[PDB]
Design a protein around this ligand. Sequence first.
Ligand SMILES: CC(C)CCC[C@@H](C)[C@H]1CC[C@H]2[C@@H]3CC=C4C[C@@H](O)CC[C@]4(C)[C@H]3CC[C@]12C
Ligand SMILES: CC(C)CCC[C@@H](C)[C@H]1CC[C@H]2[C@@H]3CC=C4C[C@@H](O)CC[C@]4(C)[C@H]3CC[C@]12C
Ligand SMILES: CC(C)CCC[C@@H](C)[C@H]1CC[C@H]2[C@@H]3CC=C4C[C@@H](O)CC[C@]4(C)[C@H]3CC[C@]12C
Ligand SMILES: CC(C)CCC[C@@H](C)[C@H]1CC[C@H]2[C@@H]3CC=C4C[C@@H](O)CC[C@]4(C)[C@H]3CC[C@]12C
Ligand SMILES: CC(C)CCC[C@@H](C)[C@H]1CC[C@H]2[C@@H]3CC=C4C[C@@H](O)CC[C@]4(C)[C@H]3CC[C@]12C
Ligand SMILES: CC(C)CCC[C@@H](C)[C@H]1CC[C@H]2[C@@H]3CC=C4C[C@@H](O)CC[C@]4(C)[C@H]3CC[C@]12C
Lengths: 207, 207, 207, 207, 207, 207
Amino acid sequence: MNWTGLYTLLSGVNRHSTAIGRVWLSVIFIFRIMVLVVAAESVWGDEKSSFICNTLQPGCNSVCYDQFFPISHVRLWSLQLILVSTPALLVAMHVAHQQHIEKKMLRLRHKVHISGTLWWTYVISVVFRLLFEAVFMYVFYLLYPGYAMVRLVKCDVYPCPNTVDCFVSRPTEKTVFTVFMLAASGICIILNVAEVVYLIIRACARR
Amino acid sequence: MNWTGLYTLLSGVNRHSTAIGRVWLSVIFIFRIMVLVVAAESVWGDEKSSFICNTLQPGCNSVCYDQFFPISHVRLWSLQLILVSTPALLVAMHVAHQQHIEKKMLRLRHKVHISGTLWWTYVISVVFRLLFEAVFMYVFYLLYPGYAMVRLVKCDVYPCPNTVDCFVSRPTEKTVFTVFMLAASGICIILNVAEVVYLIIRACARR
Amino acid sequence: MNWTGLYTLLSGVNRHSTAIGRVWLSVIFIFRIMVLVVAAESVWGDEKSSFICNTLQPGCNSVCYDQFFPISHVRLWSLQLILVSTPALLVAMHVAHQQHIEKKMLRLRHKVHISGTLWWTYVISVVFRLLFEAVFMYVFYLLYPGYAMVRLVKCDVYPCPNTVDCFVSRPTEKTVFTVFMLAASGICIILNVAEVVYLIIRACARR
Amino acid sequence: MNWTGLYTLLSGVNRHSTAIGRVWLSVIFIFRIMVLVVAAESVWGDEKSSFICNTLQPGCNSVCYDQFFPISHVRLWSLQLILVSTPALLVAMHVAHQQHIEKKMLRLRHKVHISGTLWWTYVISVVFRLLFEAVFMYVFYLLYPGYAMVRLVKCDVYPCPNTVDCFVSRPTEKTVFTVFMLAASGICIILNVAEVVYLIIRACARR
Amino acid sequence: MNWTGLYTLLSGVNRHSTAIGRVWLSVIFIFRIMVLVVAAESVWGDEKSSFICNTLQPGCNSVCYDQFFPISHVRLWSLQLILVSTPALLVAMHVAHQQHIEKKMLRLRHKVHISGTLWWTYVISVVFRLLFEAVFMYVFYLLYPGYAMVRLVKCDVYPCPNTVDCFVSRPTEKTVFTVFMLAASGICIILNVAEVVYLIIRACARR
Amino acid sequence: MNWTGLYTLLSGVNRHSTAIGRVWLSVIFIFRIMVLVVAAESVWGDEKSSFICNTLQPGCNSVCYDQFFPISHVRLWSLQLILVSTPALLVAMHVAHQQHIEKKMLRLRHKVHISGTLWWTYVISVVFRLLFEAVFMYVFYLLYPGYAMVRLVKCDVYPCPNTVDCFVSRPTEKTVFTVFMLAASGICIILNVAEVVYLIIRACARR
Ligand SMILES: CC(C)CCC[C@@H](C)[C@H]1CC[C@H]2[C@@H]3CC=C4C[C@@H](O)CC[C@]4(C)[C@H]3CC[C@]12C
Ligand SMILES: CC(C)CCC[C@@H](C)[C@H]1CC[C@H]2[C@@H]3CC=C4C[C@@H](O)CC[C@]4(C)[C@H]3CC[C@]12C
Ligand SMILES: CC(C)CCC[C@@H](C)[C@H]1CC[C@H]2[C@@H]3CC=C4C[C@@H](O)CC[C@]4(C)[C@H]3CC[C@]12C
Ligand SMILES: CC(C)CCC[C@@H](C)[C@H]1CC[C@H]2[C@@H]3CC=C4C[C@@H](O)CC[C@]4(C)[C@H]3CC[C@]12C
Ligand SMILES: CC(C)CCC[C@@H](C)[C@H]1CC[C@H]2[C@@H]3CC=C4C[C@@H](O)CC[C@]4(C)[C@H]3CC[C@]12C
Ligand SMILES: CC(C)CCC[C@@H](C)[C@H]1CC[C@H]2[C@@H]3CC=C4C[C@@H](O)CC[C@]4(C)[C@H]3CC[C@]12C
């Protein structure tokens, strides 16, 4: 893996993307992937043996975990990663498609129109990224208000004969990784905002 | 991995495929693969320890799960993924075969016939994709009517001494991933419909 | 991975192989590998915790499973996959060897003899594939008469104090994958038959 | 993997980095990654079955481990690895970005300014690495004062009916790997200090 | 992976190796690796839960398994694979070393001596392979006289209070894979014998 | 993977290394890596369920294992592998660095000095390898005097109510792999000694 090719792959071979979206948010993307890989590997390993409920009747532990964790933190971040990777995947496919069409048309001004539609597609791609990041911020906030994961919980569900206390295995560890995910996502959000406004002022300065 | 080569691999080196089948449905295919990988990795992990039945006599839990889940969601999606990947795999092999035959014949108009049969093969390839997607829609509908997975079930099978209640571990989580699969498959269906009608009107406009 | 190189690898760089053996049976081979990978990954996972026997005395479950499943379905398919991959592996090594010998001899008609022996080697390679496929059809038939895997079994072995009932975890799921394996193998068989007769009529038409 | 390309990837294609930061601290980085991989693979495997508490009431073992190990050693080292990898990742993206901008501008003195800003960015990159390493030194010190991991601990938490004794599985083994991590991090720190002072005296000698 | 390069890698870039050692025994080597991978993956999985002893006192099962299986079948085959791979690894390094020395000397008859010593090194390489294969045949014979693995065993060791009966999980399955290993190793042996005699008669015909 | 490039990677692109250090000890290094991979994969799998103690009170088994196995055999070999890989890693980085410096200086006798310092660096690299190998020989000797691993042990630690007997799962198997590691390390030691004396007599013959 060479750095020039790796940067070429991460940048989505887009010429309209400036330094922020090809360097800093690319680094943020790689950092968030690495943290997610570590979290899935070790911290959130199977995420069920971590959650123990002080009970002997079967099924109470699973239903209590489901009630208090409707969507797991690591897999919510994985879905967030995929949903924010989709716009970059799409726009990279767009510029690659124009490369293929232009290469085909070479054997057989249009270039100005191609540049304009590529710019517009990239802009809405960043907008969709920002919207997806904001939606996952609100989803994470409503599911888990406190940034730090709760250590001990009280649950009383139908299979459970009475109210019981359940323990989260690594509330502090999962809190640290949650903080890194929240910080990385917030940085990605503000980088998207900077990208959007920077492109707008470039277009306004053009005219 | 470069974007030009990756697009070349995903497009199936087909010249008759237009923008929809080389860009948007390609992105949908990648998105569905990523969601399926996440679902198999974490949400549907072994899918048996997830399903607990409130009983002590052995064998009741397994048979109750088999009755209520004849085919697991994630592996049904995996079979759907393979069956819809097969037409693209086949047509890509077709155009590659014509490339090899034409390259062999170069050393030793036919090209018009090759283009015509490639167009027809690609059309029936998209038709077979659409039929496979529709069949899996009907199969998923009959096996699981409600889009949201049922949380708690009542089963009474021969090994079970009496009727017992069984709990699905993550009904909400599996519901979310089921919604994404249904939405992605529906998008793939309508993209196939658009591809079919677009090619038909192109051929009609040719004549 | 480019399509031209991937087709080149799958075709076994053989010029005497026609469209069937380089395109359709190649797709069938890939499809059977993918289904086998999925079956080993999830459906047949460790294939022992799937088989539960209603007993408490140790060793009865394992011996009952061994009696009713002398050779597991997925690993029987894996051995079938290897034994049918061996002829293609061998003939590809043959044509590669002739490439190396001809390249060595270039530095220092024989080509007609090389083409003839390559044709004969490829023919017996397809014949050996067809025989191996037929043998595994008969082996699978004798070991498992019904295509659908039995759901519940009755076993009485020496460690078992008396006759006990054992449950197969996913008889319907394993039935579906068995159907796909049987269909894929049958398609591979008839494709081999078509390849053999097609080459014979080509040679007869030559003379 | 060739040595020239691997060195090119590790050096971050930076011309202002001298021998220390491209050779010795690169080797230290690889060594720390390998030790971390081994520690996560085997020594710190799931790090929970390692920690056993002499009790039968559920939840006491997990909460006692959380209290005595707020952040696990291996994952703290993983976060340290990522946080010290981020500056090198960033500065490599910076020099790659200038390569792309200069290549784009070639088709259409600035080079002196580019060299100056690259030097400044690399300097603050090493400074941020040194600060991150020092912060993790202080974090590791406060969380775990003694370099050798404690073998046996006494915990008394609310779920635990009374004070109980818990055993760390491999205190000596984890001590050895902790010593290697501390030594490697300290070497990385002093290498960063040498890099900083060496660049400063180079700039002073320039003027 | 192209066939020409894969054959080049498997042949050990040796010009003195004829068709048998570059084609058939190469295929046998690949086949034995694939069977070993399958055996380690599934048939011999952890090979301890497979061996159950009808007892409750701990430690009797492990010591009984150790007595009746001093060296496991799959790992004995793995050691056999490595010990027979070592001569090919060594001789390939030899011919590569002569390539490097000749390339270095080009910048600055010896070639006849290089060819002669390469031939001798390859001959003793095949001899060492044959000896290693024969040794593992005798080792496997003495450890396990019968080719078919024993199904049920009687053991009485110090931890065991009295004589107990232990069950091998898959005696028939492990028998089938043992038969394939024995057949593949025997084929490799006779191929080595053919290689040795063929090279000898070539050298005698030269003089 | 081609043989020329693989040899180039293993040799550390060093011109002062003769046949022993580029061929035989390279093969020994690969052999030791393969044996270590097999040992970690299967023989030493998690190395805790292998060690069973005849007791019911929790924590006695873990502390008894820690006392009798302060450092596990496989991970001690892994640390030995890394510590002997470090000098080759370092010297390969050295020669690569001189390649980069010379390439940079080409655009802008020194070569004799570069060759001399490369020779000295390689010599001390082999010396450090030999010292590390000898240290691990002494460490392994003091931790485990007998080459064959002990089968049964007697331990009496504070958590254990009284003296108890513990069983090592595979003393014979681990003995065989220990013998291979000891033989491979000893061969690597004597190869280092031969390398050192050979280089010394070359330098003396030069002057
Ligand atoms: C603005 C920045 C962050 C854009 C970064 C682009 C990201 C989203 C792109 C760059 C490289 C891409 C990867 C390239 C190749 C593959 C292989 C495919 O089989 C699965 C998807 C996967 C793994 C892609 C996922 C999306 C990806 C990671
Ligand atoms: C219209 C769009 C979605 C077509 C996309 C083409 C898809 C179906 C094609 C593109 C690349 C293909 C992959 C290319 C190579 C391999 C390796 C082979 O050993 C298994 C199949 C596998 C993994 C192929 C599966 C089918 C595949 C994913
Ligand atoms: C007629 C058609 C189906 C022929 C298809 C050829 C098949 C049998 C060939 C094509 C590519 C081959 C693979 C190419 C490379 C390797 C790597 C080697 O280390 C193990 C075997 C393995 C994985 C081969 C197995 C056989 C293989 C899959
Ligand atoms: C001064 C020295 C230590 C600098 C060494 C540079 C390090 C920090 C650089 C060199 C190569 C880089 C790797 C190159 C490619 C990838 C793939 C990406 O998908 C995840 C990050 C990852 C794995 C990078 C992490 C950072 C990395 C390891
Ligand atoms: C006569 C025939 C069978 C010779 C076949 C040569 C065999 C023994 C050679 C060919 C390719 C070789 C492999 C090439 C590269 C590597 C990578 C290295 O990091 C571990 C060893 C390993 C995996 C080699 C093992 C030996 C090997 C498999
Ligand atoms: C004298 C002989 C034995 C020298 C052999 C050189 C050995 C020590 C060298 C040759 C190739 C090297 C590997 C090349 C690339 C990488 C990738 C990196 O991310 C981790 C280290 C790792 C895996 C290296 C470890 C050291 C290594 C194995």
